[PDB]
Symmetry: D4
Subunit: 220 residues, 8 copies
Amino acid sequence: SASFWRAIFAEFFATLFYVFFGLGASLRWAPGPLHVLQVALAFGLALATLVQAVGHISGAHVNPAVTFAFLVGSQMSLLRAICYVVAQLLGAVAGAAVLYSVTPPAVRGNLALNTLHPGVSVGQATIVEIFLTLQFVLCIFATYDERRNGRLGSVALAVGFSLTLGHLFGMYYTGAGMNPARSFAPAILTRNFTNHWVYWVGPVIGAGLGSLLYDFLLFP
Amino acid sequence: SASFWRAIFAEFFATLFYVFFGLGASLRWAPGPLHVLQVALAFGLALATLVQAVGHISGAHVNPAVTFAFLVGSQMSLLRAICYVVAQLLGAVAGAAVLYSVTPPAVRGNLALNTLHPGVSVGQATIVEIFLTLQFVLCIFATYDERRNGRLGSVALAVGFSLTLGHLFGMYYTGAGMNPARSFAPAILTRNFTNHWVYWVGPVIGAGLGSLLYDFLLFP
Amino acid sequence: SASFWRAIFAEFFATLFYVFFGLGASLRWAPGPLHVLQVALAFGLALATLVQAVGHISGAHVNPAVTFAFLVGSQMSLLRAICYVVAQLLGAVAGAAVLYSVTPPAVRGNLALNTLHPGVSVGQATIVEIFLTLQFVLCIFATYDERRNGRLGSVALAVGFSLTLGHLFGMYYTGAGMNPARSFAPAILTRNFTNHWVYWVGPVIGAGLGSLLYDFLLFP
Amino acid sequence: SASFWRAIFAEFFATLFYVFFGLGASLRWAPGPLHVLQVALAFGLALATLVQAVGHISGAHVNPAVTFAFLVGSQMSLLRAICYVVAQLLGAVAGAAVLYSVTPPAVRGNLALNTLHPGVSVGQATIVEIFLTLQFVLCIFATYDERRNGRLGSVALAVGFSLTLGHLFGMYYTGAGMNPARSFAPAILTRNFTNHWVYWVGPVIGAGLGSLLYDFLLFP
Amino acid sequence: SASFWRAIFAEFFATLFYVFFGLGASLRWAPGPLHVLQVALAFGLALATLVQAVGHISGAHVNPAVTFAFLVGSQMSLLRAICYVVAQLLGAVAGAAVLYSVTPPAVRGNLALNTLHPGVSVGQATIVEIFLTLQFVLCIFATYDERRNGRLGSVALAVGFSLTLGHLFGMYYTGAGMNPARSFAPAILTRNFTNHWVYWVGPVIGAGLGSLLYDFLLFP
Amino acid sequence: SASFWRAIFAEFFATLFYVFFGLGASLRWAPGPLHVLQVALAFGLALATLVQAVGHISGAHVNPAVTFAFLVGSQMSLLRAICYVVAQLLGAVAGAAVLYSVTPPAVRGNLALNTLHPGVSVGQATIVEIFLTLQFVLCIFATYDERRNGRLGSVALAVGFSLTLGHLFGMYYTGAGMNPARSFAPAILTRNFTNHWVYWVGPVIGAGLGSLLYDFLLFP
Amino acid sequence: SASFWRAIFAEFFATLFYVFFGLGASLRWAPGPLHVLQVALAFGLALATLVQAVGHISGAHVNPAVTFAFLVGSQMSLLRAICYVVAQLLGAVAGAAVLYSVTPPAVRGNLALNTLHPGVSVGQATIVEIFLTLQFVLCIFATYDERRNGRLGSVALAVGFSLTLGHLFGMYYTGAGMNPARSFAPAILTRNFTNHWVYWVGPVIGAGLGSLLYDFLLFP
Amino acid sequence: SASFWRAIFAEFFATLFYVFFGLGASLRWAPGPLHVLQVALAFGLALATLVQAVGHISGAHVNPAVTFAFLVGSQMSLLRAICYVVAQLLGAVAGAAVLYSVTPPAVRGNLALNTLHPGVSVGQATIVEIFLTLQFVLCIFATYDERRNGRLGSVALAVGFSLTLGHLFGMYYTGAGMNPARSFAPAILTRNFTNHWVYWVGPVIGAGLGSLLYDFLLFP
């Protein structure tokens, strides 16, 4: 039916805004801003706003790893999962392209390219991105679990704060690229794929491990 | 009936406090405070507090763009929409006037005048203000959507965090003036209208686009 | 009955912790920490935690102005209102006294004494403290209003964020002393009452005005 | 039955992530970062994410003091309480061990070892850790109280913000070690037990006092 | 003879570099950099380097006020004094024009336009600029006094540190525009002459007063 | 003769500028500026500029302790020493009075009143002020020693950097009030003499001890 | 004779230390340190110390551009100029290699690789590096001019402060690479030559232009 | 004769003040102060002031490594070299003991104990301390070289800025302990000798190597 493509657009538009507002706040307007907390809250609130906006439509995955987790969790058709990933990657590039146009080149920089910290190895970078996306996916699956008897608040505020947690930790390590689409968007628009498989392997394994940890070790 | 004017006052008073507390926390008491996160949370929590206060009465729009979005969304009578905008603009000036009286001139400054960043063009400024207000309006419409089956937390905390998101991003670009009333209040009390149409055109288009994106591409 | 004194203790203990954790985080461990956001969130989260703790018992006023507002709002017996204020003031001094013991004198300072900013007059200080406590009381009355049909999140998170809003704004002006008990506690333990009536007149008027604004102009 | 060991793992895994993400964000990547707010939110959001993840399974204590409080509160079998503490301590070391592997030695440091502030005595350190854990446990017991008639938001966001409150205050005093497992993890992996009993005595008394204060002085 | 025009160029080139390096380091590459000390040393070291470079040729006045002081001090022919001022103003605009070309517009800003601080009146601004230039001229006249029996170090390091002193103080008040040429250069290239007479009246009076204070009250 | 009063004015004017520029840069235009280095260099460069200006005339003592040291060192007539102290104190008040007029009240504050740090006792404050002024006087006496065979640079740059050294250390302890005139000027114009004898006893003993240490233990 | 190779070593060793201490202090031990002033003084004081050390031997050029300027200024044999450049480049790599060994990889980074600022074009980068090296060379030639009748202080402190001036300005633009050897050292040891001709063309032209400007337009 | 013991005291007193003012400014009054530049200038200006004070008497070595260098350089009797080292170590402890008394325990800390950076090995720490003291000694030997034909400024300002250079670089690595006496003073008064041989081996080798590099490879 047509609720399929309304979700494909919801993924495309939300991922566009997610990258636009996320990467945009990750742009350094200062040589030293101490911007880790500021940037971490930006991604989290961007996710929280979008989940509140397009959660009922597409689930507001805006993340190939998150879509991969639901694909592993047997809650998404494969075709739709592919369609989300291509829409998220298309949305990510579109958001970063619009961000490129509206942002002066002096502060545009690398468009917040997820890059490994000098002393962080690709293996260490992979493990960190696995844990960054594992807890994040684990938080998503619990919040999106239909059986949620206990009465709590907003699932948007939860998964957003989980994303902020990952950035409060992982930004120093890998730039906190727990979103392959977010990492892809400046990689393509800057022509820089250095250690870019890390931001695909890491989140996908962490999404995969987080999915399996939830629906079999936590709630079969 | 009389629930009309109780809402007109609720808009007037809340917009007064919104500008008073928002602009007040946006006043620089330091040459470098790194105040972006501090100011962004101020507006968001100011909106969240006021939405919790006068949401049931007027909807706590405190924003001509937000009122324009509901006017476009066929949820507001035009006369009442005009009455909200004149009350919000009157409230904005009143709040900034009170802020002027209570704040020493050495820190009063331009009363936090929304001004374009040196390298940001009026077209780039317009687009940013469109996106700042689009997601914000989109978050408002989803939170204020009567059909909200999924059980979440506070709509006040949501739309406030959406406003913080816009300031975390747009303050560097345009001062994050996603509120024509907020931009109008120091423009009139400082006699400075430089690029002030940007803070009317941008938010209104973004409010208009955000409204149309919601009730036809997201939920007809 | 005995639910009276369980609330008197709840006020005493919560105000003790409110001052202890609030004033404690307001103590400067740095010559320049840029601590406004850090201190503002401390008070707000301290209030949010305590409201979650002793809200069902006493209402977690921990504020003579807040108790005065409910006394004006015809929701509190006068005797109990007096009993709350004496307990809050006793709790405030007790919390600041314990804070004095556990904190080294080099960082103890004035025990975070609410003091007027150099250029802020007592009249300007009074008006700011009125508005700081008006919105705060207004947010409390709306959150504590039994008729709260619209389904939202936590009232603790709301009134706490309202308190953070007041500190994000008023700390520069008056130290954000929207709590007479909080202002009283270091005033007595430092032997400094300079402009201390401001932190009683301001909040009480703001609490009074906020109460009247709610139950007659907002919801008769 | 088997819901026992699913909770033992939930405690082990969540405490692993709690230490991993908590201690990891507490690692200084800067000589002066002014990281108190950043680190305080990290622990709180880490707790909030994990409580949302494994709250329904084990209660997400991830804290020997918190388990001790429920043991005192007659809501936990002793054997299970021991099993939680050994799992939390095992999880804490495992999380800090993984953090050690993924973090470069130049920023690894003491692995965020809870250490007394220069002027803070062991008695003052103990009292602070008692109050840090008292309010935290008090907030947990109220949020986890089955009788919670008043409709509020998320218990995860509450207890997480309570943890942030303790770090906003106690980090200057003792590093805010209101978790014996969190304090144990770098103590064992750095071979440093200086004043380490403080981080066991303090939280346990504060957990004990917080438990007794709740279910007899606040709600028998 | 031809040592005249070699000095006219020395004034032109040094004032070009003085504005180029001075204004360039005064450009804000950060929203809060706490750049006062950094900018103050930039002007001072720029003056010290240029005085070391072209001091023996023209005296390295690079300042219409400084030339005016020597004109008042009966050590400069009037024609040459005019020729220095036109060369300094031409050099200032040339330096700021080159700075405009090499600097991205996002950080170009107002080209470090000397602007009155919000609470500083034109009379207060004038007095500050008088004192900023008085001590600076007084330091120049003493260092350039042929009778300097006492054996000291570099006159370049002295007058440069005097300029840094003026910026350490006057930047907060008026931007420390103790150089009419330096103030003129961005005023003309930004089309902004707001309170620009202050940066001519102030320094000239301060240069005049500083000259008279030296050669009649200090050393007739 | 008349070289006496030319020195009395030189002391009066230089102490006026010393307080004006010193106290002025010590005024906090930010809640946290991390201004210790900035303020320390301000006093030092202010002293260096003035020593270069009026050193040959009066010696540029601009300090009652420094005059007292030369009085003890048998290099100053007592009457002239009194005349310097009254001129320095008159100059100090005049400089702080002019600073009061030109500075907005919001940043005027206590006019940089030398105040004991919270944990610093009057005895500890006295000892620190003794050492701050001892080395400073010792540096002055060596630089002003006629027998200075070894060829070095500027005595102004030396004694100024000695003053910066004292402020880099003593500002945290006592505000680095190694000048009774500098401490007197805001004490009289703010009506605050709290622990003000410390800033007279300390520097005078340190000046006295520094004088005796030089001309008998270092160079009889 | 043998004073040739003593100078070749002096160039080699001083350039080794110049890169070692310069690049070492340019290494970011913080995500935001606001290190521009700190790094700028490091290079300048490193140059000042080395000029004081090996100035009498080789002239302490430690800069291929500086050697090129003297080669253009007809004060250096070509063979010796080549020998200085190869020694400086060998010293630069040796210094950066030792710095690599002693510095942990987490803070080693790109070894302070001179890289163009995002919005700075190669032409703008070239012009800035020309001016950075022009004034620096101009300051060197004046300080090293045998005819220096006027009695001033240290030539080491002068040329060092000139280098600090260039870094206070050029670090934002190009990293202030006014030394081809300094730019070469991390370029070779990181395998990154992006826009590396800029740091050769710019300084050499600026050194060439600075040399010609001095000995023909300033002092034939 | 008696000029021996006047120098022994000069070493004792100057090293006392050197440690007192150096370690005192190295005490952290803030969790993040970004104090590297502030502390680096403190040591350098402390050395510069003392060299100006007691340079003509003892040479103002205030450093066992510096005394060892002159002992190696055949410019000091061995007995006197021992007498300097015991006086410097006695002075260092005395200065740190006085600093202990006058400084509150909350900011006293480890008394600025030279401690290896987490990722810095003892071998890397040794090499850095060798280079920190090599250039410093090399700068001392050149400045103190009787044959100093070229006319420059102050040797005190030179060796002080060399010390600042070492702290601008080495503070991150080892705390910049290029003075065994400075490292010894808090090691003994805190009962902590962890990696304390590094601060003896490193500086002594660097002093030894710096001495030999000067008087045989630079000036036989």
